[PDB]
């Protein structure tokens, strides 16, 4: 009971076959158009999420019409709930090509029926003329690209990976434009399955000359196409299996929706195609080439923070212009916002969050607090008329080799949106910055990005920072001091952004950090270099029976049952809170904080005033106190930095290097003063 | 040291509506004329 | 046959049941690794436990802790270290072997090339990737280069290898165990010098090994006779000399190890209490020894983790769903024996 208008794809797929009691069963398939459309309409008009009682999709369609959106994101899992679609699920998985068009036509007819049956308004021509589309995004679990067989071609699958390269926009013809070179009569021809039927005769009765049709290139109509190179990360990896990179094809609105370094999850169709042996001939190779066609892309997850919007400002306006409906940041509900406010309202927020980070690592309160402040980050100034200052924070870890200073890096890497985990001796100056490589398909030379550029807007983890060669270490100066990298190589002269934080680890010379020598003789780094980091952490291991008992019990508890069961916030809520705080708040400093900052910096400069016994203070420490105070204020949803913030920043900076237990004359450490 | 590849076909679908000015329809009409035409209640052409 | 493809059945069932019925599985299997080498029983037990492995644990929140054991042998020249390395690499179903400078650079890790058959670039793995889910044997460990030492360092750390070089930025999976061999710095061990000055490798790298055996050659007119009789009998025949013991063939050894690898025992509260007490005592003790510059390293939580893994491996070998105090007793027994040569 509604109006209907057939689509061109539906008419093309019209040709039926017999042997199905409904008739109209497409040859080769088992799909039946009437039953599929009827089941889809019933499911659309009746489905609730079991707020779980209301009509789930009726509203979504209502807001779609109200706003003007043309894309419906369909969770393929939902169809398994309703009883009717228990088979439509498998039909969609096995025969996506026809099913997607069927659903699109059904959706358009549903929209028309919804608008008309309620007599809302008479302006229905726009919706009647416009297009619609449906994007599945929750296909069942896959086993990795390696494990598909030839029989899985033209099926629907999902992948996860890391973006590496994206070719520029390629024009793709859809309508060719011919002219008759004797009567100026012009014709248009529509592509059919990738073949254009050139006319053999002018169709005019007066003009009937044979082979008089020429092609005017600029007068045709073209589409958009792009190719993406993806580094997949399958969940299950067989024995001795190494990666490669896959080719994805994106069309129409999805072009330019991904940037190298992004972690994404794609849903697409598995394809195949033969490739010409050489341009001169028209012979083909028996062995086919595989790729993927993108139908949906998901750029958000609840296991990690959202991208820092400060780095993608223009991309958002471009997305709005392009009308592509991909979302960069997660959506927030009123209940969630109220819960965020309530959680911020309590008085143990700081310790609660510190304990929340990495629940499986014991104690290390100050370490966890520093990690939290790094994740929150400082405020980013932008000077009208040129000038940039960023709130990125750099941290280094020194201490005994056997502590838990490596598990920290893995957790931060897995929680951050963008980053790379690299070792010191397994790197190179070019490999960290950029290089030129020959594309195996186009047979041309193209630039490719390095770790530091790929980590823009995120966190870069460096292990064994002391084994790094001087040449390799040279580049980090500009990155840490201007967040940019300048390149002067054959074919490229430009400066690239490197808005990334640094988290580095290092080990002491020999076996153990000797408290009878200054830190400069225990760390194998030039004393000047250690002054660039905002915080320096001395992880010392002291033998104490109480702490040993506590740690041993904590570790042995983890093996009580085959699965983990360990007052800690859940990771989802933690990430939601951190993302909201980062995006919505922007603290500023006040005079009361300025006075304290100046006094503290002067005191730090004066204290300790024969040399290379301690890390001499510098302007870097003043800037570090500024950034840490701003980050603390930005936490707990405040917009003005204050004296408590500055005091906490100074307390933390002093505690990290544990100046309290240090002799200010010989630079040695007393083990009976340090507290576990 | 391989042999020659083959080619073959089979009918599945129905093409465009058959025109009359086409060889297959001409042949079908002629076959119908041979197998049906009657004179004096006799299938003269079939019998001969 | 790979362990992953294991499948219970009457044919395997009767063989395995006969083996357990015979009894004394632990020592019977331990004595069957390279039966032509005399003595060296505890090292053989440690190697068998390395073969069996521990229990992997997924702690949640994405964090991960290994379940594989690492073994280093360091000793005087001429004690059959290479023979044992060969024996283990052969017994393993995915064992790989390497020596010093023979394999370096892309010999480890992987290298970028172009496939002939298809027209796509690929990475060819080295010894580490080729030995994934297996044992990698490294002879002449101390003579390796800094880059290779760092690669082994990271692999023993977290079973992954990170590469960032021109044309490549990736991470490889290296779920492999390490069996290393090494010699003292000045050839023979020098008791008048400290253990850390007797070796070239860093103390942290030494510490990361779950088991670190020290093998010295102190002449003894009694045991030398037994060793000579054993070796000369082996040459005169082609068999070991003992008659009261029958070795078990590699096929049966692999069968039993594959069957055992399907278990996953669990910890209990009494054993947890015992382990915490033992760890506290051991950690308190080691400090004074390390002060006198007479220890390879201070005890650390990695030691406790190694004890736990060894107890789990012993339980798996016993083919039980729960651990017992005797398993922890044996683990501590082995860890204590590992350095008895320094107190002669
Ligand atoms: N505070 C702690 N909480 C939990 N586990 C710990 C702690 N300290 C040490 N460990 C254990 O000890 C090991 C630490 O080794 P690792 O972090 O790899 O060394 P490093 O980080 O110093 O290179 C881990 O396996 C971990 O289980
Ligand atoms: N306990 C032993 N029983 C039998 N043969 C031994 C024993 N110890 C050493 N050998 C012999 O001495 C040689 C030692 O050489 P090798 O295997 O390279 O060890 P290393 O590298 O320690 O010298 C071997 O050929 C082995 O046959
Ligand atoms: Mg570590
Ligand atoms: Mg040798
Ligand atoms: Zn014309």
Curated annotation (Swiss-Prot), chain A:
It is an enzyme of class 3 (hydrolase). GO terms for cellular component: CMG complex; cytoplasm; DNA replication preinitiation complex; MCM complex; MCM core complex; nuclear pre-replicative complex; nuclear replication fork; nucleoplasm. GO terms for molecular function: ATP binding; ATP hydrolysis activity; DNA helicase activity; DNA replication origin binding; helicase activity; single-stranded DNA binding. A motif (Arginine finger) lies at residues 531-534. It comes from the Eukaryota. Residues 1-19 are annotated as: Disordered. Its EC number is 3.6.4.12. It catalyses: ATP + H2O = ADP + phosphate + H(+). Coiled coil: none annotated. Residues 10-19 have a biased composition (Low complexity). Keywords: ATP-binding, Cell cycle, DNA replication, DNA-binding, Helicase, Hydrolase, Nucleotide-binding, Nucleus, Phosphoprotein. Residues 349-556 form the MCM domain. ATP binds at residues 399-406. GO terms for biological process: DNA replication; DNA replication initiation; DNA strand elongation involved in DNA replication; double-strand break repair via break-induced replication; mitotic DNA replication initiation; nuclear DNA replication; pre-replicative complex assembly involved in nuclear cell cycle DNA replication; premeiotic DNA replication. It is found in: Nucleus. Its main location: nucleus. Present with 8800 molecules/cell in log phase SD medium. Early fractionation of eukaryotic MCM proteins yielded a variety of dimeric, trimeric and tetrameric complexes with unclear biological significance. Specifically a MCM467 subcomplex is shown to have in vitro helicase activity which is inhibited by the MCM2 subunit. The MCM2-7 hexamer is the proposed physiological active complex. Component of the MCM2-7 complex. The complex forms a toroidal hexameric ring with the proposed subunit order MCM2-MCM6-MCM4-MCM7-MCM3-MCM5; loaded onto DNA, forms a head-head double hexamer. Belongs to the MCM family. This is DNA replication licensing factor MCM4. It comes from Saccharomyces cerevisiae (strain ATCC 204508 / S288c) (Baker's yeast).
UniProtKB/Swiss-Prot annotation, chain B:
Residues 1-21 are annotated as: Disordered. It is found in: Nucleus. Acts as a component of the MCM2-7 complex (MCM complex) which is the putative replicative helicase essential for 'once per cell cycle' DNA replication initiation and elongation in eukaryotic cells. The active ATPase sites in the MCM2-7 ring are formed through the interaction surfaces of two neighboring subunits such that a critical structure of a conserved arginine finger motif is provided in trans relative to the ATP-binding site of the Walker A box of the adjacent subunit. Belongs to the MCM family. Component of the MCM2-7 complex. The complex forms a toroidal hexameric ring with the proposed subunit order MCM2-MCM6-MCM4-MCM7-MCM3-MCM5; loaded onto DNA, forms a head-head double hexamer. Interacts with CSM1. Present with 10300 molecules/cell in log phase SD medium. This is Minichromosome maintenance protein 5. It comes from Saccharomyces cerevisiae (strain ATCC 204508 / S288c) (Baker's yeast).
From Swiss-Prot, chain C:
It is found in: Cytoplasm; Nucleus. ATP 2 binds at residues 208, 302. A motif (Arginine finger) lies at residues 207-210. ATP 1 binds at residues 38, 78, 80-82, 183. Residues 25-232 form the MCM domain. Belongs to the MCM family. Present with 166 molecules/cell in log phase SD medium. Acts as a component of the MCM2-7 complex (MCM complex) which is the putative replicative helicase essential for 'once per cell cycle' DNA replication initiation and elongation in eukaryotic cells. Core component of CDC45-MCM-GINS (CMG) helicase, the molecular machine that unwinds template DNA during replication, and around which the replisome is built. Component of the MCM2-7 complex. The complex forms a toroidal hexameric ring with the proposed subunit order MCM2-MCM6-MCM4-MCM7-MCM3-MCM5; loaded onto DNA, forms a head-head double hexamer. Interacts with CSM1 and MCM10. This is DNA replication licensing factor MCM7. It comes from Saccharomyces cerevisiae (strain ATCC 204508 / S288c) (Baker's yeast).
């Amino acid at each position: 009971r509604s109006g209907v208008n057939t689509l061109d794809t539906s008419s093309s797929s019209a040709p039926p076959s017999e042997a199905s009691e409904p008739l109209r069963i497409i040859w080769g398939t088992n799909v039946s158009i009437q039953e599929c459309t009827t089941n889809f309409r019933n499911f659309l008009m009746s489905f609730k999420y079991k707020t779980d009682e209301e009509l789930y999709y009726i509203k979504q369609l209502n807001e779609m019409r109200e706003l003007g959106t043309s894309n419906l994101n369909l969770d393929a899992r939902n169809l398994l709930a309703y009883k009717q679609t228990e088979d439509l699920y498998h039909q969609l998985l096995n025969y996506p090509q026809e099913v997607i068009s069927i659903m699109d036509q059904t959706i358009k007819d549903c929209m028309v029926s919804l608008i008309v049956d309620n007599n809302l308004d008479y302006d229905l021509d726009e919706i009647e003329t416009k297009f619609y589309k449906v994007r599945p995004y929750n296909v069942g679990s896959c086993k990795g690209m390696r494990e598909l067989n030839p029989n899985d071609i033209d099926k629907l699958i999902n992948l996860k990976g890391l973006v590496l390269r994206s070719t520029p926009v390629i024009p793709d013809m859809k309508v060719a434009f011919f002219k008759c070179n004797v009567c100026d009569h012009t014709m248009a021809v529509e592509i059919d399955r990738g073949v254009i039927q050139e006319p053999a005769r002018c169709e005019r009765i007066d003009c009937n000359e044979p082979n008089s049709m020429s092609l005017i290139h600029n007068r045709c109509s073209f589409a958009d196409k792009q190719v993406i190179k993806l580094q997949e990360t399958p969940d299950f990896v067989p024995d001795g299996q190494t990666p490669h990179s896959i080719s994805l094809c994106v069309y129409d609105e999805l072009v330019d929706s991904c940037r190298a370094g992004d972690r994404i999850e794609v849903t697409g169709t598995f394809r195949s195609i033969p490739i010409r042996a050489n341009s001169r001939q028209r012979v083909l190779k028996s062995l086919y080439k595989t790729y993927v066609d993108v139908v949906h892309v998901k750029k958000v997850s609840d296991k990690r923070l959202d991208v820092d919007t400060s780095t993608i400002e223009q991309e958002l306006m471009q997305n709005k212009v392009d009308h592509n409906e991909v979302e960069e940041v997660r959506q927030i509900t009123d209940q969630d916002l109220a819960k965020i406010r309530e959680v911020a309202a309590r008085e143990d927020l700081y310790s609660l969050l510190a304990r929340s980070i990495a629940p499986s690592i014991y104690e290390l309160e100050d370490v966890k607090k520093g990690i939290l402040l790094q994740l929150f980050g400082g405020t980013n100034k932008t000077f009208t008329k040129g000038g940039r200052y960023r709130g990125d924070i750099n941290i280094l870890l020194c201490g005994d080799p056997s502590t838990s200073k490596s598990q920290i890096l893995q957790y931060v890497h897995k929680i951050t949106p963008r980053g790379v985990y690299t070792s010191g001796k397994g790197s190179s100056a070019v490999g960290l910055t950029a290089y030129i490589t020959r594309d195996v398909d186009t047979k041309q030379l193209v630039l490719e990005s390095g770790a530091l550029v790929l980590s823009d807007g995120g966190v870069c983890c460096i292990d064994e920072f002391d084994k790094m060669s001087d040449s390799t270490r040279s580049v980090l100066h500009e990155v840490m001091e201007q967040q940019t990298i300048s390149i002067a190589k054959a074919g490229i002269i430009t400066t690239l952004n490197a808005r990334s934080s640094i988290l580095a680890s290092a080990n002491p010379i020999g076996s153990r950090y000797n408290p009878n020598l200054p830190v400069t003789e225990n760390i194998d780094l030039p004393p000047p270099l250690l002054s660039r980091f905002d915080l320096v952490y001395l992880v010392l291991d002291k033998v104490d029976e109480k702490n040993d008992r506590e740690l041993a019990k904590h570790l042995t508890n983890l093996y009580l049952e085959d699965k983990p069961e360990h007052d800690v916030l859940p990771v989802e809520f933690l990430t939601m809170y951190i993302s909201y705080a980062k995006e919505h708040i922007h603290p500023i400093i006040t005079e009361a904080a300025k006075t304290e900052l100046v006094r503290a910096y002067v005191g730090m400069r004066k204290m300790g005033d024969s040399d290379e016994k301690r890390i001499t203070a510098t302007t870097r420490q003043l800037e570090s106190m500024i950034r840490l105070a701003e980050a603390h204020a930005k936490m707990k949803l405040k917009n003005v930095v204050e004296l408590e913030d500055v005091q906490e920043a100074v307390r933390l900076i002093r505690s990290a290097i544990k100046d309290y237990a240090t002799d200010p004359k010989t630079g040695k450490i007393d083990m009976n003063l340090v507290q576990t | 040291s391989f042999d020659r590849p083959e080619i073959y076909s089979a009918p599945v679908l129905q093409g465009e509506s058959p025109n009359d000015d086409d060889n297959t329809e001409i042949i079908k009409s002629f076959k119908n004329f041979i197998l049906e035409f009657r004179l004096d209640s006799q299938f003269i052409y079939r019998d001969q | 046959k790979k362990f992953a493809s294991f499948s219970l059945t009457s044919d395997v069932e009767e063989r395995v049941m006969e083996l357990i019925t015979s009894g004394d599985v632990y020592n019977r299997l331990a004595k069957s690794i390279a039966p032509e080498i005399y003595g060296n029983l505890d090292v053989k037990k440690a190697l068998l436990l390395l073969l069996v492995g521990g229990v992997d644990k997924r702690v949640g929140d994405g964090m991960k802790i290994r379940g594989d054991i690492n073994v280093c042998l360091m000793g005087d020249p001429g004690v059959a270290k290479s023979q044992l390395l060969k024996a283990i690499c052969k017994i393993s179903p995915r064992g790989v072997y390497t020596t010093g400078k023979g394999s370096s650079g892309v010999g480890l890790t992987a290298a970028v090339m172009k496939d002939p058959v298809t027209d796509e670039m690929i990475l060819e793995g080295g010894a580490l990737v080729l030995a994934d889910n297996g044992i990698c044997c490294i002879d002449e460990f101390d003579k390796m280069d800094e880059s290779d030492r760092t690669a082994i360092h990271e692999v023993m750390e977290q079973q992954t290898i990170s590469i960032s070089k021109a044309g490549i930025n990736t991470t490889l999976n290296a779920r492999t165990s390490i069996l290393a061999a090494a010699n003292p710095l000045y050839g023979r061990y020098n008791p008048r010098l400290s253990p850390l000055d007797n070796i070239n490798l860093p103390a942290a790298l030494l510490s990361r090994f779950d088991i670190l055996f020290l093998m010295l050659d102190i002449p003894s007119r009694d045991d030398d006779e037994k060793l000579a009789e054993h070796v000369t009998y082996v040459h005169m025949h082609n068999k070991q000399p003992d008659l009261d013991f029958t070795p078990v063939e590699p096929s049966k050894m692999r069968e039993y190890i594959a069957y055992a690898k399907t278990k996953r025992p669990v910890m209990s509260e009494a054993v947890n209490d015992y382990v915490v007490q033992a760890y506290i005592r051991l950690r308190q003790d080691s400090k004074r020894e390390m002060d006198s510059k007479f220890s390879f390293g201070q005890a650390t939580p990695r030691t406790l983790l190694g004890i736990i893994r060894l107890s789990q491996a012993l339980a798996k070998l016993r083919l039980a769903d729960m651990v017992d105090i005797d398993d922890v007793e044996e683990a501590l027994r082995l860890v204590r024996v590992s350095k008895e040569s320094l107190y002669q």
